Design a protein around this ligand. Structure first.
Ligand SMILES: *[C@@H]1O[C@H](CO)[C@@H](O[C@@H]2O[C@H](CO)[C@@H](O)[C@H](O)[C@H]2NC(C)=O)[C@H](O)[C@H]1NC(C)=O
Ligand SMILES: *[C@@H]1O[C@H](CO)[C@@H](O[C@@H]2O[C@H](CO)[C@@H](O)[C@H](O)[C@H]2NC(C)=O)[C@H](O)[C@H]1NC(C)=O
Ligand SMILES: *[C@@H]1O[C@H](CO)[C@@H](O[C@@H]2O[C@H](CO)[C@@H](O)[C@H](O)[C@H]2NC(C)=O)[C@H](O)[C@H]1NC(C)=O
Ligand SMILES: *[C@@H]1O[C@H](CO)[C@@H](O[C@@H]2O[C@H](CO)[C@@H](O)[C@H](O)[C@H]2NC(C)=O)[C@H](O)[C@H]1NC(C)=O
Ligand SMILES: *[C@@H]1O[C@H](CO)[C@@H](O)[C@H](O)[C@H]1NC(C)=O
Lengths: 49, 109
């Protein structure tokens, strides 16, 4: 939408949780589990491929 | 709100014009400009409680902390009407110490 403006990635993930109706404390208080789940999900794609 | 469906930027409004066998759309959009960098933090710890912005981000100009809206820089001081509380400050990665100002009790002298 213009020039790239940097933001830390967990803070971008919190904006995106807001965009679906969940408060952002739910992301910050679960950060490690959410990242573990994303990593297992990405590791399952290359296994199926 | 569909990205790039009505031009580049944040769609404000669009005007139609007729062409021969066709149509022309003049899209008016909003494009952000002249950014500055800041230090930032996800929450703020005060009295053993974690505070999150209601809307906006916590930013630091070098020595002081403010809340701003995310798309236009307009800094304000962090109060209990700017933020909400959830939990204690032991669980959030990158939490920062600052004071969150209450209006009522300095009204009550
Ligand atoms: C929410 O669901 C997750 C499942 O992804 C739970 O986390 C797992 O809990 C089991 C316990 O049976 C552990 O063995 C796993 O190692 C956990 N997974 C990860 C990625 O940490 C989590 O406990 C659930 N939360 C609640 C409150 O029920
Ligand atoms: C960050 O902004 C603050 C403004 O709040 C500057 O601090 C001073 O703060 C006092 C009381 O809050 C004001 O009376 C002053 O007018 C403010 N400015 C000055 C120049 O004294 C602070 O200087 C700013 N810091 C940086 C690094 O820009
Ligand atoms: C951002 O990354 C920096 C590393 O570049 C982290 O700084 C380190 O913090 C640890 C404490 O967890 C210290 O032991 C290291 O000495 C620091 N390294 C440097 C180079 O400063 C910083 O903590 C990270 N920020 C967050 C919020 O995790
Ligand atoms: C932010 O403020 C809290 C509140 O005091 C600090 O917590 C103290 O941390 C030190 C060192 O980690 C401990 O020795 C104290 O026992 C803690 N106090 C309490 C009341 O728990 C915290 O360290 C501060 N954060 C930073 C980065 O300085
Ligand atoms: C912000 O700082 C970075 C270096 O950390 C620099 O590359 C960038 O151009 C700066 N942008 C602005 C708007 O100051």
């Amino acid at each position: 939408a213009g020039a790239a403006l940097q933001i830390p990635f967990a803070m971008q993930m919190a904006y995106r949780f807001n965009g679906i109706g969940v408060t952002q404390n739910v992301l910050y208080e679960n950060q490690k589990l959410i990242a573990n789940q994303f990593n297992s999900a990405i590791g399952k794609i290359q296994d199926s491929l | 709100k569909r990205v790039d469906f009505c031009g580049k930027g944040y769609h404000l409004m669009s005007f139609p014009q007729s062409a021969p066998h066709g149509v022309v759309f003049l899209h008016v959009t909003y494009v952000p400009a002249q950014e500055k960098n800041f230090t930032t933090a996800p929450a703020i710890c005060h009295d053993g409680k974690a505070h999150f912005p209601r809307e906006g981000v916590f930013v630091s100009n070098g020595t002081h902390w403010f809340v701003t809206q995310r798309n236009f820089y307009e800094p304000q001081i962090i109060t209990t009407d700017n933020t909400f509380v959830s939990g204690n400050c032991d669980v959030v990665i990158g939490i920062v110490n600052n004071t969150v100002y209450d209006p009522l009790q300095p009204e009550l002298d």
